[PDB]
Design a protein around this ligand. Structure first.
Ligand SMILES: [Ca+2]
Ligand SMILES: [Ca+2]
Ligand SMILES: [Ca+2]
Ligand SMILES: [Ca+2]
Length: 144
């Protein structure tokens, strides 16, 4: 992460760590959520904390909080990277990747494929039978 990002996350952490002791407990997470107009149960708060408490000591320190934010940012970036790739493959912007578009963009990526090979790729990913690859069909492949 950048210095900047670490700084914004340190500010956020400080808002949860009400007593300033360096860790966020389930009670402090309760106090933050109620201050936002929410009202979780104690079981729900233990469950939310469990997902972020990497070492299992029951509370969340700043390295664990930063690890949660870094993984959230990476998930958002991977999703954006796959969307951007789809928009680059869909050269005419109609929302579908055709066999001709896929053959052409693979050459830009350094792969010279035959029309039969690209047509096999289209049929493997084309789960609705329209002969083109739509965005969700593309995501399915890039996630497998
Ligand atoms: Ca604390
Ligand atoms: Ca911990
Ligand atoms: Ca297209
Ligand atoms: Ca399709």
């Amino acid at each position: 992460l950048t210095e900047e990002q670490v700084t914004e996350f340190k500010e956020a952490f400080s808002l949860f760590d009400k007593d300033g002791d360096g860790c966020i407990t389930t009670r402090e997470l309760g106090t933050v959520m109620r201050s936002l107009g929410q009202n979780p149960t104690e079981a729900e708060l233990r469950d939310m904390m469990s997902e972020i408490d990497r070492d299992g000591n029951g509370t969340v320190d700043f390295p664990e909080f930063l690890g949660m934010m870094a993984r959230k940012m990476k998930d958002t970036d991977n999703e954006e990277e796959i969307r951007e790739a789809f928009r680059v493959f869909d050269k005419d912007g109609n929302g579908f990747v055709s066999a001709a578009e896929l053959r052409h963009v693979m050459t830009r990526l350094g792969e010279k494929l035959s029309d039969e090979e690209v047509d096999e790729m289209i049929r493997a990913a084309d789960t609705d039978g329209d002969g083109q690859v739509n965005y969700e069909e593309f995501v399915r492949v890039l996630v497998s």
